[PDB]
Design a protein around this ligand. Structure first.
Ligand code: FAD
Ligand code: FAD
Ligand code: PL3
Ligand code: PL3
Lengths: 540, 550
């Protein structure tokens, strides 16, 4: 048995066996996976050279684990004694690696910090429970002994939600990832009871064996957990079809310092909404009953090009107005489109790349935008939705790139965080900001933000690059996501300044960022459920 | 600041011992014995088949034995409590016409519309009336009222339509001075934003007035409980009521974007934890909702509602299951069992507009039951709303599935008139109660495995229980919503009042139905109590907001 904390990079993203790297001396950037070694991505180096400039990649390696200092764990003999009376020794970890991997999430600041060995407060112990009943025991003991507890799923959050902040008390990281089994599937009710430490791909694999699927698909799907999705109410990119995570949740069990809270599968409070989004501050979710659907009979994904971001946006608007909507859509601006096409290492993909070439002779590639559009469901439904959406696309100057079998279209976003580790290894950095903005303000915010970010650095003699995509649309606007990148300097101050620039410009267009009588309400809930404040204290 | 000239309040326009408009009612024409419907728009339209239906089901010459309710001036109500200092403060901010404490005001703010409520008011049994009714005109005025009630330790109970059937507005004790806050003068749409598709609405507004006001601005909400005509937005939010277009427009909780709640410890405003869910369903125990921002939609391009007959309840259930499995569903569906189908067709008026074709569909029903035994024939009403292209696709899909389950089409009728006839049902309960009869209801969600056995067993058991006592009884059912593995099943059951007039006969009928629903795993209507108690003690430290024991 290998634990997931040993399988996922402790100072980067995702599988330890998968990574980008520079082949020397050609300089060709390649991608290695467990299934294939060193596949050349010949267009990628040219892209990085063009954008962020005899081209040399300056190496800025991460510190080796042996060279990182962490203070000794605190001691609490009488509490640890009690743990060891119920838990097996392989369930308790306090080695350097276990401590580091249960300190940090996956934000830029997290990675910068671990990569230079800056480890302020690590947890004193990692516990890996195997069942709901074990969780109940651990939480009861933490409450008795006044021990801070922080539950962890994939540790993929980018908001510091798992960072230990309570150096006065013994603190325990509860790694939920050994609780990773689908307990049952009810094919009449179309529901499934799932242990919430399960990772995304494992969940969809186990469900598929019983002919069903959940369909919750954040961009972190590969390395995040059901329990994390519930505790953060994370967005999914098939939500336009399958619902939001809170709609998918039928019920779940929450272990709290004052007892276990059960939910049932009209008037009164709908109590699940107290725990959904609570980020471990109100107890630990152990098992959830989730609404599932049959594996669809048709799954069809297509690419399209538009001449401008404006055209793509108009198509987005009219699709939503039609009330006949795809399962998934994403629109990439020209910068992200170019990146997508330089992400090329298959018979169907090169055919698409030929179609892009043809298009950009007439339509300037500086302005051309890629859109990926997917449909899932019964054949009759897919056919009606596809024909509706294609009609609207044709009316908005869309150019079909055709299709390939599968969904590897929609799975390209999963690889992005791997490129982030490659930039950080070669004197570069990349961060993100996401906003909701109305249609009236979108195109000015998009153009202004991009122009402002680049010029800020250009004025200082420093290259910088920014792209954006649209993942979701609402009645009168969109969710717009910026990805922006530049060279490292010779402090944390440069990433804080760039974010400030972006945050300011986004506010300038009433883009969304993030007497309150609800504060007293939350304080009531917290003081009642967790009177000793042991559950992920001091978190926003 | 005053109510406009000639304004009369809704508590005076809705029956104080019955349902709905005081001007609308069923009545027996004399000497013919013919049952007729009067409305404020047309008087005494005969329902020539209705008397014979009641005769057949609940029985020599047939006579309706008259059992009138007591007149209002013959009802005793204990004098109201006095709180001079509290009332004098009210008069520095509220007009005399906003404050009421006469018998009519007190009775109409005591009772909802359950059978037990109607039985009690009809016999003058009024044990816990509020002491004062206040009718605020704005959010600011509710804030003032709630601040004063907290300061003076006065019980406050908000009311909308008073249509609830669970006793939710009825004062539970008389220890403290008690105020009913009638929200119904706060009845305006404040704004509509057609770009965002949202509207800000004062929640004292009644269903039809809401849809009317929104329609003027080209939009609609689409929440349609069977009590739509005489219930309020505020009440829908505070009860999480069901609506019969929810298959298209969603539940009230998802229609609610945000709202303002006036509490004894301040006003909670809405924009981690999704806080709206703390107040939704709270039944006035956590404060008063004043104004709500609701998600609305454009008035549909196409609205098409159809009737169909099936040879048996089984055929109809199969069609419903296959419809949901296909994933292409109607905006509304209702399946009526044979007994409710018969009732529907027996209620035909003898008059109609030149633009109305009920006679065409009655005739089709009569021709159909020549080939299919009427004791098994079921009516279904199926409606579609939206863009023409969407309605066309959904209708063709659904109509295909119907033809595979032996459905027989009766055709459309204009707008939602097919679905508007359910609003008339509670007027007949008043007619029954005036003529020595009673009717009650039981609603349950039941699995498909148990649906048809529960339906047959419950109907048989109920009828037999009274037939063995030599008492006539009648029972029907319909299905209003379907789920992955079950349906919402609604029973309507009726019998004679006993010559000795005791509330024990109603609790007994209810117990039989409750018992059997429970046998078949039908739904009925916890460390979370300590959570609630903490919320309550925080929001409402003096326990003035609709105090309950449990
Ligand atoms: C490359 C990348 C892409 C991303 N894409 C998206 C996206 O598309 N949409 C989106 O919303 N977010 C996205 N995120 C953010 C993050 O992945 C999601 O919020 C995810 O829900 C966190 O899941 P996790 O299992 O990794 O949680 P963790 O990071 O381990 O924990 C998150 C919070 O949940 C609490 N928690 C975890 N498990 C439990 C439990 N069982 N009981 C109680 N509390 C618990 C933790 O204490 C913490 O407060 C992205 C992040 C990255 C780095
Ligand atoms: C014939 C009939 C048919 C019905 N059909 C249905 C149906 O199809 N679906 C369904 O779900 N129910 C149905 N009901 C029940 C009832 O109509 C619903 O619960 C409706 O939501 C109640 O609305 P109301 O305005 O009449 O509320 P009221 O009865 O006036 O009050 C209900 C509760 O809400 C609280 N309240 C009211 N306004 C406010 C406010 N502004 N702020 C805070 N609290 C408030 C009250 O104190 C009370 O606790 C039916 C009832 C009848 C009699
Ligand atoms: C010079 C251009 C190179 C292309 C670099 C684009 C890399 C995109 C990396 C994505 C970053 C991971 C996101 C972390 C937070 C998620 O919301
Ligand atoms: C034999 C004829 C009986 C007449 C049929 C009466 C059916 C009318 C149902 C009215 C019930 C409406 C009020 C119920 C209270 C709760 O909702």
């Amino acid at each position: 048995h290998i634990d997931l904390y040993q399988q996922i990079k402790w100072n980067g993203w995702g599988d330890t066996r998968k990574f980008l790297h520079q082949l020397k001396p050609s300089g060709t950037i390649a991608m290695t996976t467990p299934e294939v070694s060193s596949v050349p991505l010949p267009s990628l180096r040219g892209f990085i050279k063009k954008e962020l400039t005899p081209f040399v990649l300056d190496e800025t390696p991460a510190l080796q684990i042996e060279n990182i200092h962490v203070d000794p764990p605190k001691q609490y003999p009488e509490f640890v004694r009690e743990l060891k009376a119920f838990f097996l020794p392989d369930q308790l970890k306090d080695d350097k690696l276990a401590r580091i991997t249960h300190t940090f999430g996956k934000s830029l600041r997290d990675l910068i910090r671990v990569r230079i060995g800056q480890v302020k407060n690590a947890p004193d112990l990692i516990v890996l429970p195997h069942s709901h009943e074990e969780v109940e025991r651990l939480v009861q003991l933490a409450h008795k002994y006044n021990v801070v507890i922080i539950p962890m799923g994939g540790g993929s959050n980018i908001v510091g939600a798992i960072e230990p902040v309570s150096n006065e008390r013994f603190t325990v990281s509860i790694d939920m990832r050994r609780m990773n089994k689908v307990l049952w599937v009810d094919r009449r009710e179309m529901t499934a009871c799932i242990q919430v430490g399960i990772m995304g791909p494992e969940l969809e694999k186990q469900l598929h064996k019983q002919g069903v699927s959940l369909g919750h698909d954040p961009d972190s799907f590969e390395f995040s957990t059901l329990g994390g999705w519930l505790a953060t109410c994370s967005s999914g990119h098939q939500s336009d079809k399958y619902g939001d995570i809170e709609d998918m949740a039928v019920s779940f069990r929450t272990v709290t310092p004052t007892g276990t809270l059960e939910l049932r599968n009209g008037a009164g409070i709908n109590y699940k909404h107290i725990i959904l989004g609570s980020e471990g501050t109100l107890g630990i979710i152990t098992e959830a009953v989730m609404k599932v659907h049959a594996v669809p009979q048709a799954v069809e994904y297509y690419g399209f090009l538009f001449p401008t971001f404006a055209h793509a946006v108009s198509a987005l608007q009219q699709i939503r107005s039609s009330e006949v909507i795809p399962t998934m859509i994403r629109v990439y601006d020209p910068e992200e489109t170019q990146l997508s096409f330089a992400w090329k290492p298959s018979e169907f993909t090169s055919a698409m790349v030929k179609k892009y070439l043809h298009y950009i002779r007439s339509f300037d590639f500086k302005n051309v935008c890629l859109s990926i559009i997917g449909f899932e469901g019964p054949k009759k439904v897919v056919d009606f939705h596809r024909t509706s959406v294609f009609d609207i696309l044709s009316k908005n100057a869309a150019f079909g790139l055709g299709s390939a079998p599968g969904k590897t279209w929609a799975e390209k976003r999963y690889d992005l965080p791997y490129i982030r580790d490659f930039l950080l290894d070669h004197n570069m950095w990349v961060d993100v900001a996401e906003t909701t903005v109305s249609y009236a303000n979108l195109q000015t915010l998009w153009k202004d933000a991009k122009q402002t970010f680049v010029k800020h650095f250009k004025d200082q003699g420093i290259p910088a690059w920014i792209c954006a995509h649209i993942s979701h649309t609402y009645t009168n606007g969109v969710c717009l996501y910026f990805i922006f990148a530049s060279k490292q300097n010779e402090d944390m101050a440069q990433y804080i300044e760039a974010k400030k620039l972006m945050t300011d410009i986004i506010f300038k267009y009433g883009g969304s960022l993030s007497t309150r009588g609800w504060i007293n309400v939350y304080r009531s809930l917290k003081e009642t459920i967790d009177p000793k404040d042991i559950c992920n204290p001091r978190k926003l």
